[PDB]
Ligand binder design. Structure first.
Ligand SMILES: Nc1ncnc2c1ncn2[C@@H]1O[C@H](COP(=O)(O)OP(=O)(O)OP(=O)(O)O)[C@@H](O)[C@H]1O
Ligand SMILES: Nc1ncnc2c1ncn2[C@@H]1O[C@H](COP(=O)(O)OP(=O)(O)OP(=O)(O)O)[C@@H](O)[C@H]1O
Ligand SMILES: Nc1ncnc2c1ncn2[C@@H]1O[C@H](COP(=O)(O)OP(=O)(O)OP(=O)(O)O)[C@@H](O)[C@H]1O
Ligand SMILES: O=C(O)CCC(=O)C(=O)O
Ligand SMILES: O=C(O)CCC(=O)C(=O)O
Ligand SMILES: O=C(O)CCC(=O)C(=O)O
Ligand SMILES: [Mg+2]
Ligand SMILES: [Mg+2]
Ligand SMILES: [Mg+2]
Lengths: 111, 109, 113
């Protein structure tokens, strides 16, 4: 199992959501964050570093779904301009659905 | 050492907090997030985000089952949307005031 | 690659930022959180209050770096964030398998540099 955390431009949330869902993702968590990358929050063209509003998407999936999730995030979030965002993939040891106590694959599965 | 991330309904925070603390688990970070699961945010083909809280609790391996047990007991109810728990590895923990590491940065006293 | 997740006092963000960027660590994500540590949100602790718990506002900083930069990052956060009082903060380091820059599709080292 892996957690895929992607930080993207806020306006791109709707496209990303639809792309992931059409590819069979059935679970995701979003929050609002502030960040900067290489360009220190500057869109123009003095080292005054600024934060911009971004959305952080977190999606837990089995290993065989990882490439698909990354493909759809990249296709939905990209515009070609600096600040398009970053994706981080990390291990998940165990997943549990609280209502039923199901584990791992079963806790990750559809309706 | 492991991180336990639980996404629960916001109004269950107080029960979870009490369940965990009575069992000796004393350190937690909480954040407001929005989410959906396999019902795609429906309480009744649209997809909606609902308000949840994310709890993050870092503990020693020996305490993981305890943390899961208490979060489940406090937050399970029987209605869809009760939440989901993710367990991941932590390689190092450091207490900023002291520079204490690992087991020492995670326990009391 | 590791993710460094540092929970600190909100007023220490600026100093932590400057110290990271001056050290060539350029890229971070910040968010507002609430928490307690072993003092359970209490700076005044009373008989029986061990089982009461208050949440305080903190800031969570998340910084993904290469393995070789982890000590530098911890050092800089600890020096900028430390006040000497309970509640100064706590840092969690965890593995990251992959990092990808969305704009270019570049990966790992090149997506952190
Ligand atoms: N190393 C990092 N650690 C944690 N968060 C990061 C890191 N790098 C970027 N971010 C987060 O990702 C958001 C988007 O970063 P961004 O797309 O600017 O990356 P970049 O490497 O500068 O690529 P680009 O040259 O395309 O702008 C940032 O504003 C910040 O929230
Ligand atoms: N695979 C996942 N990745 C990331 N977040 C998820 C995932 N599954 C669920 N979540 C998050 O956890 C919250 C609670 O999920 P939920 O309790 O609805 O799980 P479920 O699998 O749909 O089970 P139930 O049938 O009991 O509702 C979601 O709103 C979302 O924030
Ligand atoms: N084990 C933990 N898991 C998750 N979050 C924690 C943990 N311990 C601390 N935190 C987060 O870190 C913040 C600051 O912790 P703090 O510095 O109070 O830790 P401490 O162990 O109590 O040390 P001090 O004795 O220096 O207070 C907390 O408010 C909470 O957000
Ligand atoms: O995030 C943006 O829109 C531009 C700023 C940027 O790319 C950065 O700070 O790395
Ligand atoms: O989270 C809820 O309150 C109900 C909707 C749901 O369970 C879901 O989206 O998976
Ligand atoms: O966070 C503070 O400033 C004091 C309370 C504390 O240290 C804690 O809850 O562990
Ligand atoms: Mg950038
Ligand atoms: Mg559900
Ligand atoms: Mg404390």
């Amino acid at each position: 199992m892996k957690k895929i955390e992607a930080i993207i431009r806020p306006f791109k949330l709707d496209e990303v959501k639809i792309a992931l869902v059409n590819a069979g993702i059935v679970g995701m968590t979003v929050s609002e964050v502030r960040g900067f990358g290489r360009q220190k929050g500057q869109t123009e063209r003095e080292y005054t570093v600024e934060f911009l509003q971004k959305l952080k998407l977190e999606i837990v999936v089995e290993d065989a779904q990882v490439d698909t999730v990354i493909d759809k995030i990249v296709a939905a979030a990209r515009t070609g301009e600096i600040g398009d965002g970053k994706i981080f993939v990390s291990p998940v040891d165990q997943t549990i659905r609280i209502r039923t106590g199901e584990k791992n694959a079963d806790a990750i599965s559809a309706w």
